[PDB]
Structure 1
């Protein structure tokens, strides 16, 4: 009917009606909950390849209706002409093209609708770069460099998305093969161990297998692997002066900087799909700024990532014989103190998990007040350390799928037919 959420620390109760506008299956049923499944559902709004008219047009009407409602038209002359324009365009090309305003609206609302994102208080402050005129990998690389430069802004980071041509028949996709624009290589060592970042071992190897000569260090910025109009991907080296990096040091442990650690300042996800009114932008790299835990809890401490916990623990002279000394927990805190201290000292935008979660609670209040709800995925909103001492831990959330949205998509190398 109409669902309430309660915060068990403040007793604030919020009432959700926005979920009634949700279209896609979450994967749950009355009998099974899938809220901890990474990809619970395959319910897409359109089928395989180029859809028929009765498949694409109703999705397009819905988005156009939604956009003209958002600006307090709907039924206006411009709205009705737009519907005719979309209809003729689908009739004559089997697709349609978004206006600049519709594109900007759709990208912001994809971010506004991203139930897993704790950063959404910023959703309407997003710089949209229209790259729909792009035709080649070289052009994609040019757009990405300008994105990286604008978004980095000498450390005063600015949220941005660059949107490449939409999918047509599915054999002409634009893709950024990288998962993020900036990532460190991972090297599969002969003695079975791993040098660099273990997440990227496979992609690192694709790059090598494509002709990349690895410098074979521990912080090798990977090349860009860009695919335009379904052609074979091409390698490009981001100019180093565009890749802002922060040396990790600790405000008290002077031996910390001697660990020779750094991280990059710009998180820019580049393997997701942006879906607006039935159109699918398979290359839409988007960026904001880091929550400190994303580098220092996940990027340094996952067992299949950097795993430098022990060395920080060893350097801290901790009992590592048994878990009940909580040596992992102690080192994990110090690493996250160090990451934040370094980014703040170099005036690179960063947010701690206490501040980001507090902002999200505020965003939730705003969304329920003016929009009747806010989709939120508790499993992803709660930070990976110190969860119960942040306000989101005690906040009930409702998760549901609204459109426009960002969607997962398969890595292109499982799909690509080379030439």
Structure 2
């Protein structure tokens, strides 16, 4: 009930109390740990609303004030009448910031309080959504000096009137299968790519074709929009010592911006809530480029480096992996687009944990996700015990819209 976590590299020990305020369930039992699985009414709403407003009014130091009780009754009347309610702007900003704060898989929550919240609850059409999204991209990109932001569309109602961005991120590259047999472009996006082609997109069929946005307002069929190319900031990938690196032809976009998650605040569901911050270097260098089912380029890079590829024990995969990642970092820095390296990001996150343990009484953290996908044990997060638990407000996964939507 009072829990201790230990850093085995420094012997720092923190006590967790925050976990007792956990609501949702983990997947785990006393019999089976599931910590490595990727995805494990009027009556219903009022509790959820009350829990949220209680923490809201406590955070501004008005717990048990008139204004607190009064809001609680006003929302109570709203629900009992309309079977739903609206968040105030202030509560919306707080809900959003805290959803990020409670994101146990997010290594960059040291930034949680500097989030620009754009309220788009007045939106009615895909065109409207396209407009908010472009202002979001422009704002967050900031000519390379990236800034955290989320844009929030209208909340779920009956459930047939949902706003969704079909894309997984605002900015991704297309995926094409070939007669040849293999995949041109990002193999991760082949299915979405055909939904765009099958919706009307004329695909340039290149390796790095930015995808069009597929936007759905009010449960309607989604519509295509190309993001003004002048708004998509991209970085050519070169190496600070390998002259031939640039001839591999690699580029990546500067703005990571997740668009397929569902934001839950005080029982209310915001099914379109694209958010953006900036990249940890390994996300691109390790995962996007080197995953066997992504751009999968290790084999081709190791060749240029002329390493011994006849035996795994030469560690050629590892040698090539480092250089690829050196080059991502170097490129972004040289072009002055915000990026963070895994050493810096994890060091930051440990400082954040230490703040949250003393400010809040804990920090939910998912070790499987927090530890970078390269050089794990030489970053401090590796040695840090973490407690994973689910707090609200939260971001949550949700079914791909194309499995659900009806035409």
Q: TM-score, normalised by structure 1?
A: 0.96
Which SS does the other structure have where 1:383 is aligned?
Answer: coil
Which SS does the other structure have where 2:252 is aligned?
Answer: strand
Which SS does the other structure have where 1:300 is aligned?
Answer: helix
> Which of the numbers 110, 120, 124 marks the counterpart of 2:113?
124
- How many angstroms apart in 2 are the aligned matches of 1:66 and 1:363? 21
- How many angstroms apart in 2 are the aligned matches of 1:56 and 1:292? 40
- How many angstroms apart in 2 are the aligned matches of 1:225 and 1:317? 43
Shift of 1:52: 2.6
Which SS does the other structure have where 1:362 is aligned?
Answer: helix
Shift of 1:34: 0.4
Structure 2 unmatched ranges of 5 or more: none
- The more displaced of 83-92 and 231-240 is 83-92
Q: 1:191 to 1:172 in 2, by over 3 A?
A: same
- How many angstroms apart in 1 are the aligned matches of 2:82 and 2:316? 62
- How many angstroms apart in 1 are the aligned matches of 2:312 and 2:404? 43
Q: Deviations over 1:322-378 (max 9, x none)?
A: 211111111110000000000000000000000000000000000001110000000
Structure 1 unmatched ranges of 5 or more: 39-49
- How many angstroms apart in 2 are the aligned matches of 1:89 and 1:192? 57
Confirm or deny that 1:245 pairs with 2:241. Answer: no
- How many angstroms apart in 2 are the aligned matches of 1:338 and 1:52? 52
Which SS does the other structure have where 1:256 is aligned?
Answer: helix
Decide whether the 8 Å contact of 2:282 with 2:325 is kept in 1.
yes
Shift of 1:401: 0.3
- How many angstroms apart in 2 are the aligned matches of 1:284 and 1:316? 43
Shift of 1:51: 23
Confirm or deny that 1:348 pairs with 2:337. Answer: yes
Decide whether the 8 Å contact of 2:140 with 2:146 is kept in 1.
yes
Decide whether the 8 Å contact of 2:34 with 2:40 is kept in 1.
no
Q: Deviations over 1:160-213 (max 9, x none)?
A: 000000000110000000000000001111121000010001101110000000
- How many angstroms apart in 2 are the aligned matches of 1:20 and 1:384? 30
Which SS does the other structure have where 1:275 is aligned?
Answer: strand
- How many angstroms apart in 2 are the aligned matches of 1:4 and 1:65? 27
- 1:44 matched residue in structure 2: none
- 1:95 matched residue in structure 2: 84
Confirm or deny that 1:274 pairs with 2:240. Answer: no
- How many angstroms apart in 2 are the aligned matches of 1:273 and 1:255? 43
Q: TM-score, normalised by structure 2?
A: 0.99
Decide whether the 8 Å contact of 1:175 with 1:228 is kept in 2.
yes
Which SS does the other structure have where 2:303 is aligned?
Answer: helix
Summarize the alignment of residues 175-186 of structure 1 with structure 2, pairs less than 5 Å apart.
175-186=164-175
- 1:42 matched residue in structure 2: none
- The more displaced of 61-70 and 112-121 is 61-70
> Structure 1 residue runs of 4+, over 2 Å off?
none
Shift of 1:18: 0.3
- 2:55 matched residue in structure 1: 66
- How many angstroms apart in 1 are the aligned matches of 2:341 and 2:208? 24
Decide whether the 8 Å contact of 1:51 with 1:94 is kept in 2.
no
Shift of 1:76: 1.1
Shift of 1:77: 1.5
> Which of the numbers 400, 405, 410 marks the counterpart of 2:389?
400
